[PDB]
Amino acid sequence: MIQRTPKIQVYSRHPAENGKSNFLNCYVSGFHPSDIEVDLLKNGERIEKVEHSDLSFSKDWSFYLLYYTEFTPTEKDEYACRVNHVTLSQPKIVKWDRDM
Amino acid sequence: GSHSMRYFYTSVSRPGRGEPRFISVGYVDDTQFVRFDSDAASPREEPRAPWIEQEGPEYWDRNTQIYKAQAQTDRESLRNLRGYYNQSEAGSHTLQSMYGCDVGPDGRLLRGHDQYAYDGKDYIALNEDLRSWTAADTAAQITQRKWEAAREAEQRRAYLEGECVEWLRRYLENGKDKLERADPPKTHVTHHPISDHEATLRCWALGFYPAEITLTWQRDGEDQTQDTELVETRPAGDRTFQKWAAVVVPSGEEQRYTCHVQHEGLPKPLTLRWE
Amino acid sequence: EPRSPSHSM
Ligand SMILES: OC[C@H]1O[C@@](CO)(O[C@H]2O[C@H](CO)[C@@H](O)[C@H](O)[C@H]2O)[C@@H](O)[C@@H]1O
């Protein structure tokens, strides 16, 4: 069976400014098969109300999904995305950096 | 301009846990406009773009019945496929389908597509002539012979030349500027010291549609291709896209670097700098 | 609008 490892990017919908409402995104793409677990973390803890886009795929048949939640960034709060997939030997955690 | 419509189906078997999960999504260019999920409470086609909402109840009802029938067909295909490949009846497998039309500015069909992948590998595809199939292996030749005897290619051709084109034309008329007129990127350059001797210049493109874009850094007008970090284009979540490109430069040399942005929505290519 | 269902594979 084809396995492809997910690419992950974590980022905000708009440039972050502390105290201003925004969306936090975790974009997982380039993966196969489709079974995948994605959590958004705030200070290491799973964020509860997280939505995701409808499963779709690219010309090479690899899948992509956007996981997202409304948030208000601060100076202190740390955010990240945690991804589990058959191709990953442990969960991959990617930290949100407002400059990327 | 030129436009496309595409439907993407994914069926995933789960033997022992019931019927396969079927998900479909529809796109006009880079805009998703409909979805269906067989695992929803009361599965039906649902709108995912504002401009499709105006379609009447007969539209949603007809498409819902199509997806319910297609899910059952995909379930039978998954059963047939594991038989063709002599695979275990315990395992989970994936069948993906992609089809649609590419049209020119006049709304005429340029190219039709109807193709399939099994476990992430190309399986069978309708040729450009819309009349013949290409099979990837001897399993797929079984499917090919079945579909040749059933005149399946004619059924696909009829859709791709007829309904696909006609409905795409209609979505474009309804979509208007959201689909016909590109939204150029909002752009800016940021600067991040790494040390006393080096800094990162990062060129940002935000809020653009469609997704196709080129970002390049130049030093005195020479492309810095081998030294630029470029992220993959990514969705903002509001139907627009984002990308950035970065270069690390010597402190005090920033004025030598310019970022060049090409996008359909821009009157002309942009040259940006740290300012 | 989607295409009407295929024959099975
Ligand atoms: O993960 C938090 C959760 O773990 C518990 C034990 O079930 O406590 C641990 O974490 C606390 C918070 O950091 C510590 O104060 C404590 O020492 C540690 O055992 C729960 O109390 C807590 O909700």
Author numbering:
A (entry chain B): 0 to 99
B (entry chain A): 1 to 275
C (entry chain E): 1 to 9
The article reads:
Here we describe a mechanism by which an HLA-B*0702-specific acute myeloid leukemia phosphoneoantigen, pMLL747–755 (EPR(pS)PSHSM), is recognized by a cognate T cell receptor named TCR27, a candidate for cancer immunotherapy.
To exclude the influence of different crystallization conditions on protein conformation, we generated fully isomorphous (having the same space group and very similar unit cell parameters) complexes between HLA-B*0702 and the following peptides: MLL747–755, pMLL747–755, DOT1L998–1006, pDOT1L998–1006, E7P-MLL747–755 and OSE-MLL747–755. The highest affinity was observed for pMHC in complex with phosphopeptides pMLL747–755 or pDOT1L998–1006, with KD values of 1.9 μM and 7.7 μM, respectively. Formation of this bond required a 0.5 Å shift of the Arg62 side chain towards phosphate, which occurs in concert with Ile66 switching to another alternate conformation (as indicated by the arrows in Fig. 2e) to prevent interatomic clashes between Arg62 and Ile66. In the pMLL747–755/HLA-B*0702 structure, the guanidine group of Arg-P3 is H-bonded to the Asp114 and Tyr116 (both in strand E) side chain atoms, whereas the Arg156 (α2 helix) basic side chain is H-bonded to the Glu152 and Gln155 (both in α2 helix) side chains. Buried water molecules help to stabilize the Arg-P3 and Ser-P6 side chains at the binding site.
